[PDB]
Automatic annotation (TrEMBL), chain A:
This is Uncharacterized protein. It comes from Toxoplasma gondii. It comes from the Eukaryota.
Automatic annotation (TrEMBL), chain B:
It comes from Toxoplasma gondii. The lineage of its organism: Eukaryota, Sar, Alveolata, Apicomplexa, Conoidasida. This is Putative 50S ribosomal protein L17. Belongs to the bacterial ribosomal protein bL17 family. Transmembrane segments: none annotated. GO terms for molecular function: structural constituent of ribosome. GO terms for biological process: translation. It comes from the Eukaryota. Keywords: Ribonucleoprotein, Ribosomal protein. One of its GO terms (cellular component) is cytosolic large ribosomal subunit. Residues 190-203 are annotated as: Disordered.
RNA sequence: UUUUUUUUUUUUUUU
RNA sequence: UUUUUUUUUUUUUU
RNA sequence: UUUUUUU
RNA sequence: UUUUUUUUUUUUUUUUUUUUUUUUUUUU
RNA sequence: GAUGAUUGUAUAUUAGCGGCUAAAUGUCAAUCAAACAUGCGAAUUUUAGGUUUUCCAUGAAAUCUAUUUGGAAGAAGAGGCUUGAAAAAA
RNA sequence: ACCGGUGGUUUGUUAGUAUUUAUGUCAUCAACAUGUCAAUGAAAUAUCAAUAACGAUGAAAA
RNA sequence: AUAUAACGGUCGUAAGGUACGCCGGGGAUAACAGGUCAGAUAAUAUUGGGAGUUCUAAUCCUCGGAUUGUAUCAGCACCUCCAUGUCGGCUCAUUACUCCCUUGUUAUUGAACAAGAUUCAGUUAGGAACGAUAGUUCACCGUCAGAUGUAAUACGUGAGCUGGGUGUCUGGAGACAGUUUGUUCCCUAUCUAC
RNA sequence: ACACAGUCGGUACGAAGUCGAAACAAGGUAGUUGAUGG
RNA sequence: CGGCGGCUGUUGACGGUCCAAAGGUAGGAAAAUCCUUGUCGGGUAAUUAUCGUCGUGCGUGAAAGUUGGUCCGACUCUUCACAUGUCGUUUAU
RNA sequence: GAGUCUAGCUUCAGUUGUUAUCUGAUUGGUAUUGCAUGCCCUGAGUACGUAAGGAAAAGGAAAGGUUAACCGCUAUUUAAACAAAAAA
RNA sequence: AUUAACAUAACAACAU
RNA sequence: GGACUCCUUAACUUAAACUGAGGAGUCAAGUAGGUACAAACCGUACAAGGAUUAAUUAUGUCCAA
RNA sequence: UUGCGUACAUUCCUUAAUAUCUGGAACGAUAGAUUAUGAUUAGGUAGUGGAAAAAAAAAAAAAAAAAAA
RNA sequence: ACAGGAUCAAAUCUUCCUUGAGCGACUCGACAGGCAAAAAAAAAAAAAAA
RNA sequence: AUCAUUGUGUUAUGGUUCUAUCGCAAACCAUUGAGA
RNA sequence: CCUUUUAAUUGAUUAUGCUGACUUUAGUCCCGAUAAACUACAGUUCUGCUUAAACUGAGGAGUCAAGUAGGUACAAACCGUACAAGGAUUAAUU
RNA sequence: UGAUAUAAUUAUCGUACAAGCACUCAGCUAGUUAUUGAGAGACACUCACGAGCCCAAAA
RNA sequence: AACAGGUGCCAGGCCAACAAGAAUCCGAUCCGUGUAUUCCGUAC
């Protein structure tokens, strides 16, 4: 078949939000949760990229130093 | 797509036991066969989660039929390997290993990450009770009994919880109604050990943790470092 | 006997 | 006028 | 807010 | 072990089977 | 079909008022009963499309002869329009 | 009054202007591709200083 | 002194085909489908006459008029406008008629029983098999006897399929068949005033 | 929005007070009551 | 180098008359032709489809090419045999 | 405010069709049928009829056909072939 | 540097 | 070289919105109103323009009004 | 019996009239300030007629103008 | 709910009245569960303890 | 003056055509130089 | 400014009009036959096809196209590549 | 919330309406001209001179 | 037409080898050939 008329702006607008919700509920939300789980485990290290990549690490940084109690740095030795 | 079709179509649909693979059955079986040998030769492989959940089915059966030590079983084992190196390893390092392990010699670990080039899940298929394992394995056999006894002797709660179970294993003295004192009395010889048959040399080997060391130095990289080759070669474009 | 007709757009026929 | 009443009838003329 | 029915 | 008619069973209920919705709340 | 009106190849001939044609109006630079390019040889149409700001005054016909008379009013003639009015007390 | 040199007017403030080449076709043939020789600014012989901020020149800037 | 008798007068005694058909503008394929029309004709009832001849109405044939309706034939306009003998079959369907069988015990009957004929009524219940020849469909022929088996819907149905002649299309809006957590669990929602 | 997505029309502050309500009349004191035998 | 026929009388050898250059020869014949069911026989539970035959129903027609023995066949049709989801009516990998 | 089960409404075709009087201690007073193809059996060789011939009330059953459901049996197709011993 | 069509954002609204 | 209606009338199946004539209105080129729903029928003191006003017309007077 | 609803006023206010005949052959006049009870008026396809506008360019007329500066 | 009320007043076991129909019935008040992993024809199957 | 909320109003950003001369006689006029 | 003139060809929602931009259809359609491995003490993965010999005294048995298409850092850039006598008797030097 | 209302354009007897074009915007685009014509009962402006008016090409 | 060029944009009196005012007032930044007034050169 072939379209008989042109689609209005309103319809498109509606469709936009429809699609956005559709995608968000099924892709993005799942991906976010999957991403966030990996934090507990050590970061991933690739052998191929060893030529340029930084050494491996386990420890995670703290993005919010304002709510970071306890010592931050150690005093230099004599 | 729409993300709704997936749900609409899936209603009243049964799950497949064996995951489909690209190619004819004859091809699929070949693929799985070769991957089993490659898994035997490495100790851990990095594969997609669906595939990792599929190869583990044959990974268990290979070791299950390798321990029988029968002409019949030997045939089936033969029918599942390609290279001699995998046969050698299976029959000389893995069979002695899982002497006391009833089953479950492998596991699957999810990486919770997506491929850069494919956006696909990833997982590790590693054997159990191997050097450099992701996580430690539980004891079996007399080791298990010793662990249990230790647990029991630790605290009261353990004693109470293991009371029933301990009876079967014989860790409770029926003549006094108390946990056995000496645990070494329950030691028995395993299959893995060597049965009894019944120097001032300068070339004597030196004891060391995996294998002994020679009293001489040989200029040779490790087995994994004496054979180099380009992983991939660029293919120039033809505009 | 009459008021009530094609009032055959609907209800109603309340006389 | 009587539950008499698939095409069957009675009573009374309202 | 019905009419008519001679002597 | 699965599917199917080429096998087997019923041919009853309709105020029944079933169901997405408690309603004295007249200006959320 | 494949021992024969077999297949295949370098370089060549036939030019539109034409040639080719074991004869189809089949083919001649992927819609040839008459090819393609150019034209101060500056293309014709009773059919048919379009025809751009406002206000005001006045205001049609589908009838007649002729055209060997047609039809979806073609052309020519006649006919049809601004003539009048409508302002009053013994 | 020929001939050489210099200057001005009209054509022409009202008119208009083209030289190089990417692409089509066997050929004839057809054709106005892509702003300017160009950061911007009258002046760059004003474009300084640099680590965040405040600072320099300029009518106007990061 | 001939023609123009096509006599408002150029006849100059100068004709046909194209299923090889291009261009321009109009809607007509050689039964003029549909709608409209209702001549023939169809439904119900009625009257005249002829059968049943004892008997005009158990039942059957035919005539006139009136009402309703239009299946089919002829005719066909100014209206309409797709491509065909103005459909043959397959798939999938809706509606009306007391519609082929099953109901009205028990008075309409030339109804002894059995098997039969005409007419009417419901709260509209359950059912009705194939083949050969392809002469576009009708009389008839052979089998199971499922037991005398009609119309409308654009041939019902061709962006669902097709065949020996009496084109193509990947579904935007209606409808129909499936499916939908929620007051919150994406983001945002900042009084009163001294 | 039912709409060829337009036009006409479109809300009447105080008592949300009260130490008022007195120069009608009556009054079960309610800031109550006024006609009527079908 | 276009083609080749009327009345009437006894199934009718035969008789009258008109016209013309001559007045369809033989063969084939329900047909690459008339007619979309001509009579009879062979096949099938049914054959109008098709073969054989009759030669009237209309008609064709001889170096216009007619008829055809034997041989031959990418030419129509009848009929026999094996297997077969073409099928009533649809399944599984 | 929240969980469960539910009342009312809705549902193929379609209808408004039901109960005077009231056993005196005498074995007691309507009751789940709307519906319907063909053939066979009891009723029955009876009603009917010179003869031939040959019914109904009710129930019971064997084919054929439609819808729906299911895998106990049969037929077609097809898959699987692995952890009892704490001496392991 | 540059009009319209077209594309995105901010603010403004309560008899609901 | 005209579409509907009124009177007369030719043709046709006293058929058809056909085909064709004689003379009046309307539309064509006419608004708003009535006739339920789409020019032709009735009425009009019939649309230069603006506002919150009075009227016998077709015709109506139970409800939608 | 007597009733009633209803479409259309140029009553009020503001415009217009170009084929010789609307008073007007009037009045005014230094190039017209629109008539107050003024008569006929102002639906319109085809065709015909009148009038007002379209920001621009050219021209050798952009300071004799109150008050204030 | 035997919760409230009357009486020269109820067998153990409330004579009688009120609760409009004790909020349609039961029950809860740290009540209830969307998404993820894993499993998954409808449906069912996990106590907490990194 | 109907945003109930998917609308409208204002404003802003983005998009958006593209012109800087490298030229100006063979005709006419005036003036000047040598020689007739 | 006003006034006179103007051969400007001087007037737009529409000719499926010519030359451009930007929406809708519309995150719809389109994806070519066979892969895998590169480890924690040795090794030979599977599959399709089957002219892959380069002095042996002999110029690998030919033509044509590429207007230089198997050189080069996981470069669509820059920079190179055609020797008919085969230069390396390069059996030496260090 | 109440009342009311059939996109636009051309042809046509016929608002004919299920006929023809157009998604939208920007630029271009369709009555041009009397040294030669004119007032003819369907429509014809104005200036000068006057029984007299104009004067062509050289210049 | 003092369009003869340039100087930051409209110059008879400024650069351009030969005449003629750095003229006065006004000016948002902001030079300013611009408005008003006035002088002078010219066989340009």
């Amino acid at each position: 078949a072939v379209p008989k008329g042109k689609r209005s702006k309103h319809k498109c607008k509606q469709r936009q939000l429809i699609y956005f919700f559709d995608q968000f509920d099924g892709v993005f939300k799942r991906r976010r949760e999957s991403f966030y789980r990996s934090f507990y485990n050590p970061p991933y290290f690739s052998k191929q990229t060893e030529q340029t990549s930084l050494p491996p690490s386990v420890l995670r940084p703290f993005r919010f130093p304002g709510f970071w109690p306890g010592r931050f740095a150690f005093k230099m030795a004599s | 797509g729409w993300s709704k079709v997936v749900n609409f179509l899936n209603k009243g649909v049964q799950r497949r036991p064996h995951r489909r693979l690209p190619g004819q059955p004859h091809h699929q079986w070949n693929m799985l066969k070769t991957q089993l040998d490659q898994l035997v030769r490495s100790d851990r492989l990095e594969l997609t989660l669906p595939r990792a959940h599929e190869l583990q089915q044959y990974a268990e059966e290979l070791v299950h039929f390798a321990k029988q030590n029968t002409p019949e079983s030997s045939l089936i084992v033969e029918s599942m390997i390609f290279t001699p190196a995998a046969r050698r390893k299976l029959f000389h390092e893995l069979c002695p290993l899982y002497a006391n392990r009833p089953f479950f010699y492998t596991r699957v670990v999810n990486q919770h990450r997506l491929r850069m080039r494919d956006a696909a899940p990833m997982a590790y298929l590693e054997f159990v009770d191997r050097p450099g394992e992701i996580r430690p394995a539980r004891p079996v056999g007399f080791e298990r009994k010793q662990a249990i006894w230790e647990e029991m002797q630790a605290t009261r709660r353990g004693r109470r919880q293991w009371w029933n179970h301990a009876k079967k294993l014989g860790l409770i003295d029926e003549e006094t109604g108390d946990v056995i004192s000496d645990i070494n009395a329950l030691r028995r010889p395993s299959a893995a050990e060597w049965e009894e048959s019944d120097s001032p040399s300068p070339y004597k080997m030196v004891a060391a943790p995996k294998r002994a060391l020679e009293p001489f130095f040989v200029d040779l990289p490790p087995p994994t470092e004496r054979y180099r080759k380009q992983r991939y070669v660029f293919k120039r474009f033809r505009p």
